[PDB]
Amino acid sequence: RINTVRGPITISEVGFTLTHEHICGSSAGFLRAWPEFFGSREALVEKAVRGLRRARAAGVRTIVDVSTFDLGRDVRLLAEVSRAADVHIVAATGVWLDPPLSIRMRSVEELTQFFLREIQYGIEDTGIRAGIIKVAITGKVTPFQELVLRAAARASLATGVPVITHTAGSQRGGEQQAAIFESEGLSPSRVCIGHSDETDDLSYLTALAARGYLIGLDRIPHSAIGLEDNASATAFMGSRSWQTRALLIKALIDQGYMKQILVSNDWLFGISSYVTNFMDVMDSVNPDGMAFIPLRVIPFLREKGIPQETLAGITVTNPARFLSPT
Amino acid sequence: RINTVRGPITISEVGFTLTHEHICGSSAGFLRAWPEFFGSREALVEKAVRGLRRARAAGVRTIVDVSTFDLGRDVRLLAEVSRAADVHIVAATGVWLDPPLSIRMRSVEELTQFFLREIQYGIEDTGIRAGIIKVAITGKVTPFQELVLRAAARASLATGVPVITHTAGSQRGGEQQAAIFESEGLSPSRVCIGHSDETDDLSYLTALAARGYLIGLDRIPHSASWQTRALLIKALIDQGYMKQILVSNDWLFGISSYVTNFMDVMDSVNPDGMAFIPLRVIPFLREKGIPQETLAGITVTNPARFLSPTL
Ligand SMILES: [Cl-]
Ligand SMILES: [Cl-]
DSSP, X not given: OEEEBTEEEOHHHHOSEEEEEOSEEXXXXXXXXXXXXXXXXXXXXXXXXXXXXXXXXXXXXXXXXXXXXXXXXXXXXXXXXXXXXXXXXXXXXXXXXXXXXXXXXXXXXXXXXHHHXXXXXXXTTSOOOOSEEEEEEESSOOHHHHHHHHHHHHHHHHHOOOEEEEEESSSOOHHHHHHHHHXXXXXXXXXXXXXXGXXXXXXXXXXXXXXXXEEEEOOTTOOOTTXXXXXXXXXXXXXXXXXXXXXXXHHHHHTTOGGGXXXXXXXXXXXXXXXXTHHHHHHHHOTTGGGHIIIIIHHHHHHTTOOHHHHHIIIIIHHHHHHXXX | OEEETTEEEOHHHHOSEEEEEOSEEOOTTHHHHOGGGXXXXXHHHHHHHHHHHHHHHTTOOEEEXXXXXXXXOOHHHHHHHHHHHTOEEEOEEEEOSOOOHHHHTOOHHHHHHHHHIIIIIOSTTSOOOOOEEEXXXXXXXXXXXXXXXXXXXXXXXXXXXXXXXXXXXXXXXXXXXXXXXXXXXXXGGGEEEOSGGGXXXXXXXXXXXXXXXXXXXXXXXXXXXXXXXXXXHHHHHHTTOGGGEEEOXXXXXXXXXXXXXXXXHHHHHOTTGGGHIIIIIHHHHHHTTOOHHHHHIIIIIHHHHHHSOOO
């Protein structure tokens, strides 16, 4: 069974899944300390409920919120929004790119114990258990990031929950992450190399898929095309069109790796970890929010000739296989 | 009146005050996410209550917990420990040395609003209002630290609450901070230049004191000698600056922001904890001939004048 912020669900209940999302991108404790940065907590909840309900109308049944402790994960927020939108949310453990000292001073053994607490016992005092481990790296894996990857591998092996990654500031990092994961004996079928739609290097994508990794083509709506005079948008969202990202889905299908593909928007309903009012910039690029995948990318791939049951396999079957602990 | 984690108190209730302390040195949300790092939340509470009760029995009536959001300040922990030990605790706003992105991406105007929120409205959803602003800087003030210092001055100017600082990685640095504070129009009498016992340059400290800054001699037991640091108190008294001295331990009862089990190292060096100032430093100064009344001025009068909001 798969643990969600409302409790455990069966594989049949997962449905159409977005595998790389967030309710809010923040920092530990920040939403509780300065909710007015988001207007108010109540406003953020309203926005996320409206957005998740729109995604639900368009067919979404589950999202994976990959927010870690250091990205400000507030599981009580996740649960409130999941319940009011009536959309399943899987919560994450792990470490993103902004660990505070209390995290980045820890050893691999200590990190392993922290992840196991959040998966096996619960997050904070809530009893809500994580269903995925998120890890993020920078171009060249730092010593501390290698400790995070090894601890993630150890926690996945103990619990069966999967690991999802991404690399910042580099269009490729999967080969370096995969080498660490395999040195710990982790099966590639437990790992999603996230944000792989940041590159057009098909050789790199196919070789990872061929080893059994999941390929997260999961920032599809992120494009600053038309926002050239806004340098902060270009840096965060890139200069490649959503179509260019989506066609990587077609390319991996066409090479026989339909079962290795996971798709998402990498959206959120508030963000404080970047420049002020960046939420408004993202919203102006993609008014559809989390509904971008079902409403625009799916029809786009159908128009290019991909059969509907292959798309159903990518959006339903693959994420259920990935999330189910094994 | 002075805001504490149990509400406002009058100056006369403040009493003997330790001006630079912590209950827990951590990171935002960490005690809530991994209480087992400290054994348990219950174990940290019991340790802190015992330690504060020991300090109270040695004469302490108030501590200033200078822990900021990014040092893991948990005002509900502070309120629980304050009530159990019957020691007043003043909580802090500001920014320490480990701001997360949601803080260090912010402008001076945004940081000002955040500090004002914590002073004027309350911390998180608790209604507990900060009574001091803490700012930490490193050797050569960074552009971000300068924004923090200016936001601190602006919040102080709007509320009357004082500012305490310190420079990590150097034995001086007060002049850098003073220049920024004065450029904002902040009175030196609202500012304590903390960790000033880390230098032996007596002429540097005397010059700051003559400009009206408070001098925080507040890491005395971290000589790991403490007597030499404590003689700086007598030296500043002899220069005529008794009214400008604040003394403390810079102690805590748990710490996760450094190496694992550093708390055990600290406890082995200073088993007196927060009672080190009243049990060791005060008798040392009296034995060196400082009158009782001068010691009461430093430990009672100066902190109340500093903490009392003064616009
Ligand atoms: Cl992320
Ligand atoms: Cl501090």
